[PDB]
Design a protein around this nucleic acid. Sequence first.
RNA 1: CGGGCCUUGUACACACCGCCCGUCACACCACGAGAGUUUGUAACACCCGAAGUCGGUGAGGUAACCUUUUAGGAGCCAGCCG
Length: 115
Amino acid sequence: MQKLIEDITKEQLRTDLPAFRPGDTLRVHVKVVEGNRERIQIFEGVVIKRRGGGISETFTVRKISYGVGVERTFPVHTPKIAKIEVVRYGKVRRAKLYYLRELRGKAARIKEIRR
RNA sequence: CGGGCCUUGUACACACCGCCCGUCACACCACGAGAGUUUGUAACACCCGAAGUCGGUGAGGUAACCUUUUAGGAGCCAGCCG
Ligand SMILES: [Mg+2]
Ligand SMILES: [Mg+2]
Ligand SMILES: [Mg+2]
């Protein structure tokens, strides 16, 4: 990729994010604005993908909520995320965990790493 | 044709101008059948699997106790797994 696009966008890259990879469990603290009030909704879930480069990098987290799978895809460097905290590092064998979309319950379990 | 007497059969006794059977028509009621539709009951097979007990683990943590004292150790426990 152009150094020029890299240079224009460098200022908007967040530095405060922890290293995570697909299979890690995050709590993503999302700024939310229902009404005029501002509050933090937490989205806890498995990272199922992380694609793209630089300011365009996104990640997707998946949770089962009330018996329904939910995925939220965020720009890595969105200012709408207050913070990300890694709950547990998973042991997976690939970059994209789309096979989890078809699994529920015990079949959908990811082993932890001592990282 | 009307009547009299004996006898006999009779489901007749308003007493044969008696009684009475089945369809058909009409109304109402209950019931059966009926392409189906719908509601519920008790099971069964498989999938999934909470809580909890129990059994594994426990590289993590750990007032009481043993050895010793800045300690290991025992036992305990979170978590994990069945
Ligand atoms: Mg990548
Ligand atoms: Mg005479
Ligand atoms: Mg009927």
